[PDB]
Amino acid sequence: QTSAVQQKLAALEKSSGGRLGVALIDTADNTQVLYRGDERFPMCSTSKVMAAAAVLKQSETQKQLLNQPVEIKPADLVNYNPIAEKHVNGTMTLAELSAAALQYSDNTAMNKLIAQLGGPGGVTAFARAIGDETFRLDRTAPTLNTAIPGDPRDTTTPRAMAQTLRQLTLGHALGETQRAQLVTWLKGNTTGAASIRAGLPTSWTVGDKTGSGGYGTTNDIAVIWPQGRAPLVLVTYFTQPQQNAESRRDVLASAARIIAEGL
């Protein structure tokens, strides 16, 4: 029952010391369970899904776009870029950049995707094109994770992001080849084992994208294919009052467990 789940989520938030935002879409009956579902949260690297999806949308009309080489230059390097730094003064294809951004949260890769879309305004324009009026990307990858309270830059709501993730992976926002590619990348994520995945049965298939940033911001957005029932879309956003708070992936796992046990 939704109220029971929301009460548990409220208990989770209270014990966590932070602010918790949850949106669950159960596609079996299109019920939605929200907790702070219309509050804005910093997206951090969960925004990489929109950027990958927008480049996939570009490739629907620019054939072979994903195989185009992109130069990685020293000026592209930033703090966290475990794939792209191995290609400085070389190239990576836009497919490789998308995979690196999604599966390793590589921030140089994300910056190349943002640039390929015409800047943060271009990523935001893609969101608007697919009916997301809430998402806003305002900054490039080495600064969009500051997650300062009160700062509307690089934020969305749980409800908006769950609706958009559903449209991208289970709906028709992308062509079929592109949708399959996005889902393949998300299923291959390497950074999510402690977040939503840790609160779910291992026999369920998950595609997800984590995010983290300042103020102990710890996020995860996921498409879930349980056994025995239709897919779920789950967004879990979490942020804390101290600028130097530690990440709490285990809180997202608890959110996912409450959802997976209660609905």
Rounded CA gap, 154 and 220, in Å? 15
Q: Please report the resolution in angstroms.
A: 1.5
CB 74 within 8 A of CB 87: no
Type of residue numbered 258: I
**Angle, nearest 10°, between helix axes 48-59 and 107-116?**
40
Q: How many residues does the chain have?
A: 263
Rounded CA gap, 163 and 212, in Å? 21
Q: How was this structure determined?
A: X-ray
Q: What angle do CA 50, 54, 55 make, to 5 degrees?
A: 125
Token pair of 88, please? 């400085």
Report, at the CATH architecture level, how domain 2-262 is classified. Answer: 3-Layer(aba) Sandwich (3.40)
Contacts of 106 (CB under 8 A, 6+ apart): 80, 81, 82, 83, 84, 97, 100
Token pair of 33, please? 């369970």
CB 209 within 8 A of CB 233: no
The half-sphere exposure of 252 on its side-chain side, counting CA atoms within 13 A, is 29
* Range list of H helices, 117-157: 120-129
Q: Report domain extents, the chain.
A: 2-262
CB 58 within 8 A of CB 65: yes
Query: Strands 232-239 and 19-26, how do they pair?
Result: antiparallel
The continuous run of DSSP H or E covering 4 comes out as helix 2-16
Token pair of 211, please? 């995010």
| Residues with a known catalytic role | 45
* Range list of H helices, 146-201: 158-169, 176-187
CB 259 within 8 A of CB 229: no
Type of residue numbered 42: P
CB 112 within 8 A of CB 84: yes
